[PDB]
């Protein structure tokens, strides 16, 4: 059946998502979404609930129209926050709908949005200062502005080290000058290429 291939893809898509294979989760869940019978909106919506965070982790943000169309406006402020690098808004938006997200089974996956939100925040700092040697204290200012409690220079280094290790940021920390030295060629790769 087409209904059974759709159900199969739905579940292996969820498996992949929970194993942090987001490219594969995207393949399976996209397929399920697209081949789901146009008539069953309830089915399409359930799939979208999983496909959404997976898309977002790969740098594809949903339109507010999509979210309206399937009554998933719970994702709207989260999407806006992630897109901006607005950690403070992300935290609030996640809390506001904590129960829904948990009942959807995607709460922990949504937590992974903090990683790319950090990435987006730091990219904005780079775009605003327009230099390839960025003082670590500038990132600290951004994180204080986002009200990360107790944050200090050591924490900025730890966050940057994780982003560099994962491939989100192309550069290295020079401790003599407390600078982040980033590549002159596009130091913030598209999120779909970091996977």
């Amino acid at each position: 059946s087409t209904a059974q291939r759709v159900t199969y893809k739905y579940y292996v898509g969820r498996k992949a998502m929970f194993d942090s294979d987001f490219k594969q989760a995207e393949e399976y869940l996209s397929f399920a979404f697209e081949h789901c019978h146009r008539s069953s909106q309830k089915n399409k919506r359930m799939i979208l609930i999983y496909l959404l965070p997976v898309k977002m982790l790969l740098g594809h943000m949903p339109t507010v129209e999509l979210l309206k169309k399937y009554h998933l406006m719970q994702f709207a402020e989260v999407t806006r926050a992630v897109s901006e690098g607005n950690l403070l808004l992300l935290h609030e938006a996640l809390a506001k709908h904590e129960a829904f997200f948990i009942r959807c089974g995607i709460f922990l996956i949504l937590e992974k949005l903090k990683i790319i939100t950090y990435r987006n925040l730091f990219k904005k700092v780079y775009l605003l200062l327009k230099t390839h040697q960025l003082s670590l204290d500038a990132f600290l200012v951004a994180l204080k502005f986002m009200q990360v409690e107790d944050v200090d220079i050591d924490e900025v280094q730890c966050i940057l080290a994780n982003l560099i290790y994962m491939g989100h940021v192309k550069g290295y920390i020079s401790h003599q000058h407390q600078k982040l030295v980033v590549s002159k060629q596009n130091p913030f790769p598209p999120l779909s290429t970091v996977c």
Binding site: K55, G59, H60, M61, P62, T63, E65, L66, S83, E84, G85, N86, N120, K124, V125, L127, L128, L129, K130, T131, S135, D137, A138, V141, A142, F145, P190, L191
Partner: peptide, 30 residues
Amino acid sequence: VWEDNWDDDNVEDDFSNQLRAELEKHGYKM
């Protein structure tokens, strides 16, 4: 349905402006 253009190199939005003010407030300008 899906947007990628959010991740261009444009900083004309409200949040960007607020962060720009905060940075300048601490001594950081381009």
